[PDB]
Each structure stands twice: as structure tokens, then as C-alpha cells.
Design a protein around this ligand. Structure first.
Ligand SMILES: *[C@@H]1O[C@H](CO)[C@@H](O[C@@H]2O[C@H](CO)[C@@H](O[C@@H]3O[C@H](CO)[C@@H](O[C@H]4O[C@H](CO)[C@@H](O)[C@H](O)[C@@H]4O)[C@H](O)[C@@H]3O)[C@H](O)[C@H]2NC(C)=O)[C@H](O)[C@H]1NC(C)=O
Ligand SMILES: *[C@@H]1O[C@H](CO)[C@@H](O[C@@H]2O[C@H](CO)[C@@H](O[C@@H]3O[C@H](CO)[C@@H](O)[C@H](O)[C@@H]3O)[C@H](O)[C@H]2NC(C)=O)[C@H](O)[C@H]1NC(C)=O
Ligand SMILES: OC[C@H]1O[C@H](O[C@@]2(CO)O[C@H](CO)[C@@H](O)[C@@H]2O[C@H]2O[C@H](CO)[C@@H](O)[C@H](O)[C@H]2O)[C@H](O)[C@@H](O)[C@H]1O
Ligand SMILES: *[C@@H]1O[C@H](CO)[C@@H](O)[C@H](O)[C@H]1NC(C)=O
Ligand SMILES: [Fe+3]
Ligand SMILES: [Zn+2]
Ligand SMILES: [Zn+2]
Length: 340
């Protein structure tokens, strides 16, 4: 009754959810689906209660009647005396990242290069960069812009999946879940790091969290911030320290959604769950930490400080903001799960 069913995407999220379930004494239990779109359908059916979503999926879920409940909040600078749970969200910066050694590559010479995207339909990985490219090109043929890409969730036989690697056995190539080696923020950054692609569309944080020893992962151990550059819309290249002046957009933070009729109950349970397993929580790091997965961003982003109350009681349109909603609307003209 005051039990919340979380929806995990893929087997690694399922494993994390199971540990949370055990530690929560079954106040939270787990349903699993192979894609984020399927988890949305489970929530619509009432077979799951909630999951945390990137803004592009929130647009999808919102059209079907789902609502944002709490948002990820990461480290701040202003609103300093304010408690994390009450602090306004700031958004994250969507960036385009390349290797310094790939000289003369700029926003203006991206045509026919190789690209690394977090997944189709996601904010930094797809909606913002492809939205910009469509506008600048005056063409809906965004699938013919890059020579080859990894964009998890596209047709595995298309050039949009040519660079995706699948799992350890080479299966599930291009699936939009963490079994795909190049899925998500860390996966697309890895796709650039290994020189599989020429450019990764990720967020500012990703670059910092995976360089200069911040990650102990084999592929990331030796990466240095200085070996990367950001691509600016004016055609210049800048150091990764200049993201505030060289990003493609500011994105709304990922947020937990649920059916409108279940929102209040989901909010109550999660606030108590974070008091236990959140950043300063009673049982973290001793038993279980909700916001940790070893740089893998499972269920929540690893840089999450807390889940924050929204205020204004957002509709999903208000939460995403009018600038962003119109951008997606326009990109989607180029090409129940279409609930509107
Ligand atoms: C781009 O993304 C970067 C990664 O998120 C941002 O850099 C971070 O900036 C925040 C402040 O806004 C720093 O917060 C710190 O929190 C730490 C304690 O919890 C302390 O830093 C210590 O830990 C880091 C790892 O988190 C280590 O590098 C080191 O031990 C350090 O002493 C500080 O007390 C500080 O508040 C954070 O350190 C930065 N992250 C990293 C990993 O460098 C950056 O601002 C973003 N840029 C823009 C323009 O938004
Ligand atoms: C790609 O281009 C499209 C269309 O050229 C962009 O859509 C446009 O976005 C702007 C900014 O949000 C909208 O301007 C707004 O107009 C409304 C009223 O018309 C007003 O409320 C705001 O003050 C603002 O001026 C504009 O309406 C919208 N155009 C259309 C036809 O929908 C889109 O933003 C571009 N994509 C990207 C990723 O930038
Ligand atoms: O960043 C300071 C700024 O944060 C808020 O901005 C957004 C996006 O984070 O918060 C809500 C929730 O997602 C959105 O409605 C706001 O979007 C607007 O502002 C962002 C800049 O952050 C911008 O990219 C969008 O184009 C806007 O639509 C709030 O506006 C406010 O608290 C400020 O403190
Ligand atoms: C389970 O939820 C009930 C209802 O609030 C609460 O009494 C208890 O603290 C919760 N236990 C855990 C481990 O989350
Ligand atoms: Fe995102
Ligand atoms: Zn800006
Ligand atoms: Zn409102």
C-alpha cells in the first residue's frame, strides 16, 4: 500500500534495484523492462509506480499523462544556506566534446564525421544536437548527417548504430540500456575516449567525472582533461573549463515521474528513502547508497546530492520550460506510446 514499485531499465539497474529493495525491507520493490519506453508503459498500466527520467523522456511521459514528482539536484554554488531538498534546480550543460588531437574539427565541420550519442530521444545526447543540426541544415535527414554513429535506440542495421558495440558477448547491439557498451553519458564519452567516434554529445559533468583520476575504470584511468576540447556554436574550440561560455544548451535536470494519481504517495516514500540511503543518509555508506553505482549512473546519476521538491507544482511543460518543449516539438515533426 505504501509500497512503491520502481521500474529498472535493463539487468544492471535491476540488480541495483534489488539491493535497494532488500535494504528497504520491501518498502520499494522492482519491475524491469528492456527500455525506458517500456518502463513508461508499465507505469501507465499501473504495474510500476515510478522511475527517474532524462528530460527527453519526460516529454514522452508527459504527453501520456505522467507528471514530474522530484528532481535530481547536484552540487551548487548559490542558494548556499538552503537545504538540498528545497533548493531550486539549476540544470546541466549539454556540450559537444572532441579530442584536442583532432585539430581543425569544429561545429562547422561535423558533417560526415563519426558521432557518439547517449541515446535517441535524450536531451544532451540527441534532442539538442540533432535539433540544432536540423535547423542549420534545413533538412530532416539527420540520419544522413554523420557518416557513422552510435545512437542507442536507432535501427541496428542503420548507420546510426554502426559504431555501437553491444554487450560483452557482442549481443544487444544498440539497445538503449546499459548492456550496450556505449550507452548513456559514460558510454558515449567512452565512445569518444576510445576514438570510436569523433564527437560525443554529453553533459559538462561527464567530462570531469571521467578524467584526471576521478574514474578508476580501465578505459578512463589515463584520460586527461587537457586532451579534450568543447565545440562552441560560434565555430571555436575551448577547454573543458569553459563550459559556461561554450555549451549547446542548458538542460532541465532528470526527474522522477509517476502517474498523476500516485504522485503524492511516490513523493512521500522517496523523501523517506533518501533520508536513509541518500548522500548524508542514516545507512549510507554503511549498508546502501542510492546515489552510487561506480560511475555507471544506475537509476540515478552518481553526482546526485538529493532529490528535490519542485514547487509551483509543475506540469511537465512547465518543468521542461517553453524553450525546450518547442525544440522537441520541431524535431519530432521530422519523424499507446504516441499518447499525443
Ligand atoms: C562541470 O562539471 C563539473 C563536475 O560536476 C563541475 O565541477 C565541480 O564543481 C563543484 C562546485 O560547483 C565542485 O564541488 C565540490 O564538492 C566536493 C566535496 O563534495 C569538493 O571538491 C573535492 O572533491 C572532488 C570530487 O568531487 C575532487 O576533485 C577533490 O577531492 C575536491 O577537493 C569541494 O568542496 C567542492 O564543493 C566539484 O569539486 C567539481 N567537480 C569535480 C569532480 O571537479 C563544474 O563546475 C561544471 N562546470 C560548469 C560551468 O557548470
Ligand atoms: C529550430 O528552429 C525552430 C523554428 O525555427 C525553433 O522553434 C522556435 O523557438 C523559438 C524559441 O523558443 C520560439 O520563439 C518564441 O515564440 C513564442 C511565440 O511565438 C514566444 O512565446 C517566445 O517569446 C519566443 O519568442 C518559436 O516560437 C519557435 N518557432 C516555431 C515555429 O515553433 C527551435 O527552437 C529551433 N531548435 C533549437 C534546438 O534551437
Ligand atoms: O539555473 C538557474 C535557474 O534555474 C531554473 O531554470 C530551469 C532549468 O533548470 O529550472 C526549471 C526546471 O527544469 C525550468 O523551468 C527552468 O528553465 C529555464 O531556465 C533554464 C536555465 O536553468 C533555461 O535553460 C531554460 O531555457 C528556461 O526555460 C529556474 O529558472 C530558476 O530557479 C533559476 O534559478
Ligand atoms: C518502511 O516503511 C515504513 C512506513 O514509513 C516505515 O515505518 C519504515 O521506516 C520503512 N523501512 C525502511 C527500511 O525503509
Ligand atoms: Fe540527460
Ligand atoms: Zn547558455
Ligand atoms: Zn503551473
Amino acid at each position: 500500500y505504501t509500497r512503491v514499485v520502481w521500474c529498472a531499465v535493463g539487468p544492471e539497474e535491476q540488480k541495483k534495484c534489488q539491493q535497494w529493495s532488500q535494504q528497504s525491507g520491501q518498502n520499494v520493490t522492482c519491475a524491469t523492462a528492456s527500455t525506458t519506453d517500456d518502463c513508461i508503459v508499465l507505469v501507465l498500466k499501473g504495474e510500476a509506480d515510478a522511475l527517474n527520467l532524462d528530460g527527453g523522456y519526460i516529454y514522452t511521459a508527459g504527453k501520456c499523462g505522467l507528471v514530474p514528482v522530484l528532481a535530481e539536484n547536484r552540487k551548487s554554488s548559490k542558494h548556499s544556506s538552503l537545504d538540498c531538498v528545497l533548493r531550486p534546480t539549476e540544470g546541466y550543460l549539454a556540450v559537444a566534446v572532441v579530442k584536442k588531437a583532432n585539430e581543425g574539427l569544429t561545429w562547422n565541420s561535423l558533417k560526415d564525421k563519426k558521432s557518439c550519442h547517449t541515446a535517441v530521444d535524450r536531451t544532451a545526447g540527441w534532442n539538442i544536437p540533432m535539433g540544432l543540426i536540423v535547423n542549420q541544415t534545413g533538412s530532416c535527414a539527420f540520419d544522413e548527417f554523420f557518416s557513422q554513429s552510435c545512437a542507442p535506440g536507432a535501427d541496428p542495421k542503420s548507420r546510426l548504430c554502426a559504431l555501437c558495440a553491444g554487450d560483452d558477448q557482442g549481443l544487444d547491439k544498440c539497445v538503449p540500456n546499459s548492456k550496450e557498451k556505449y550507452y548513456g553519458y559514460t558510454g558515449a564519452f567512452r565512445c569518444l575516449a576510445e576514438d570510436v567516434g569523433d564527437v560525443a554529445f554529453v553533459k559538462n559533468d561527464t567530462v570531469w567525472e571521467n578524467t584526471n583520476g576521478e574514474s578508476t575504470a580501465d578505459w578512463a584511468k589515463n584520460l586527461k582533461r587537457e586532451d579534450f576540447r568543447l565545440l562552441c556554436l560560434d565555430g571555436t574550440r575551448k577547454p573543458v573549463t569553459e563550459a559556461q561560455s561554450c555549451h549547446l544548451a542548458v538542460a532541465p535536470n532528470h526527474a522522477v515521474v509517476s502517474r498523476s494519481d500516485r504522485a503524492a504517495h511516490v513523493e512521500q516514500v522517496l523523501l523517506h528513502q533518501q533520508a536513509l540511503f541518500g548522500k548524508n543518509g542514516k545507512n549510507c555508506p554503511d549498508k546502501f547508497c542510492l546515489f552510487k553505482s561506480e560511475t555507471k549512473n544506475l537509476l540515478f546519476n552518481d553526482n546526485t546530492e538529493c532529490l528535490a521538491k519542485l514547487g509551483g507544482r509543475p506540469t511537465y511543460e512547465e518543468y521542461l520550460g517553453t524553450e525546450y518543449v518547442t525544440a522537441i516539438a520541431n524535431l519530432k515533426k521530422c519523424s499507446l506510446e504516441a499518447c499525443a
